[PDB]
Design an enzyme around this catalytic site. Sequence first.
Site, short mmCIF file in Angstrom:
data_model
loop_
_atom_site.label_atom_id
_atom_site.label_comp_id
_atom_site.label_asym_id
_atom_site.label_seq_id
_atom_site.Cartn_x
_atom_site.Cartn_y
_atom_site.Cartn_z
N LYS A 7 -25.43 -21.51 2.96
CA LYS A 7 -25.69 -22.47 1.88
C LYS A 7 -25.67 -23.92 2.36
O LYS A 7 -26.14 -24.83 1.67
CB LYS A 7 -24.67 -22.31 0.72
CG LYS A 7 -24.87 -21.05 -0.11
CD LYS A 7 -26.27 -20.85 -0.67
CE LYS A 7 -26.33 -19.77 -1.75
NZ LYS A 7 -25.59 -18.57 -1.36
N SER B 84 -21.02 -9.75 1.59
CA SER B 84 -22.48 -9.67 1.57
C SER B 84 -23.07 -9.38 2.96
O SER B 84 -24.09 -8.70 3.06
CB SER B 84 -23.12 -10.91 0.94
OG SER B 84 -23.06 -12.00 1.86
#
Lengths: 310, 310
Positions: free
Chosen positions: B41, B271
């Site tokens: 991110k 994830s």
Amino acid sequence: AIYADNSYSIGNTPLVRLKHFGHNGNVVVKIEGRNPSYSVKCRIGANMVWQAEKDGTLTKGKEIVEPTSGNTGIALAYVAAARGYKITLTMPETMSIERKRLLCGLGVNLVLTEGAKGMKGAIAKAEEIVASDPSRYVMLKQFENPANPQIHRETTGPEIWKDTDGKVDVVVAGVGTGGSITGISRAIKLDFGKQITSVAVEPVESPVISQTLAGEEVKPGPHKIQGIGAGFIPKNLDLSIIDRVETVDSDTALATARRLMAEEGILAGISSGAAVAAADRLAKLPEFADKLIVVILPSSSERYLSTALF
Amino acid sequence: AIYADNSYSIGNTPLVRLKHFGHNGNVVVKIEGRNPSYSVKCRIGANMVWQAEKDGTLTKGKEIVEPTSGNTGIALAYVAAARGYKITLTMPETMSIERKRLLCGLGVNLVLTEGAKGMKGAIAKAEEIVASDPSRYVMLKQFENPANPQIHRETTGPEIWKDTDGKVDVVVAGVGTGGSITGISRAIKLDFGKQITSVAVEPVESPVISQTLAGEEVKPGPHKIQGIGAGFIPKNLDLSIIDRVETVDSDTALATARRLMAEEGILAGISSGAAVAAADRLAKLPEFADKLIVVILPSSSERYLSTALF
């Protein structure tokens, strides 16, 4: 550029110029948090294992045993998993649950020693396990293993040379094993021939390098600057290449780490704040005004969430 | 190579070949944990701010307001600190103390919403704050902001092209905003002209991409695979470039993340385990035997210490 395992992905860490420390951008930081297991120690975890393999002390089936749960433990855990060695780390039973869970996650055989015995207990136990089957167990010995500073001579130092196009004038690094400052210093001064200023950083609470070089009584003390201030002169600290020693106190180191976070958007650890505080002090002497100062930031912040940093 | 601030240090993350997944080393992982604030991110935190600056929506003195405390929040916090913007992040009051302390450490103005209201409450509050002085506040909107996938087209995708010398055949990525898979896919397929297989990964508990593409009733559900499975089709997921959708369950994702840790010495997040489980499934189909499969591992493990991972 596909690494055959995670040990080979070490280093190539970036240099970021500081905005709220130094003078006209003369302070620059090397982010050693950007590493396989998120510390500078991944470089030595990798190289100590590689070196023991090449010299035949580490073979298929032999198991690593080290008295550490700090950055070095985490580093060796990841390397051991990447390269398929069992590893046991000894540590006082009073260590953090987070650290227990992290090392256990990495597949370490955790051996908890008596709280009361502290570090001494863990070191003794490591030695005891090795003694019980010396052909089975291998202790790599980060404080004295030349593979430690050597990796910094081969990677960390040349990375700094390259990223600064030879313009680095000062390297500032906290001393734990002394590997970083030693290896970097040998690279720049000896391999690249530049007469830079090598600055060791230690806690004012435990200023044993300063005491030693001054010929005074060596008096270690407790401090909270984790990763540095071991309380003795490690063999992997080449005092010959140290030009200067800066002492920093724990509170300043902590406040400096918080400043890096909130003012620079750099997620560094406690020792990173200590190193920057020292560099900032140098950076505001006129003698260092036109000098490019490069500072090692050994670790990242999420490793210190349980600690006084937050 | 000295970055003017920590936002510019994004990316150049390494590819590591897996030993205990796939077949004859056909599975390779991209370690997005090696980033300024330790997630994928950071690339979008950086680019969304850069883009809003270039188009004049973000100026000196304006303040950022986003409804996020996940990876995106942390990413924007670091960028905002690096570039000298105030930032407010809204979030349910029931968020982790660690996450509170981390964001607060990065100098975020934290706005806690009613527990009972959850995400909805935080989004509403963000919108409310912006509405109160639209000339003062700017919401960057990660689910729809094209600067999100664009950074992955410009950096993440070309990095994969380069590190594989064009040999990548399959890209596997979990979908949150869809930015990663979209941008990477556009880079490889459109900029470099290779007809790879783009594989989206989502939780079997909330398989809304699979339901949508099948023309079935969309039925989101709770899962523990943090970072993916938003429960709707985000605008930054270009379904046109998706060739395949793999669903993974939470337990498998967790067990796979633990395996990466203990067997590969790779410190990845939940994830990351989901993405590898899907890639491993593909990697053991004969149709993918001679194919190089590249998997995004979005985050690192110490971010999940409080969680079911440990």
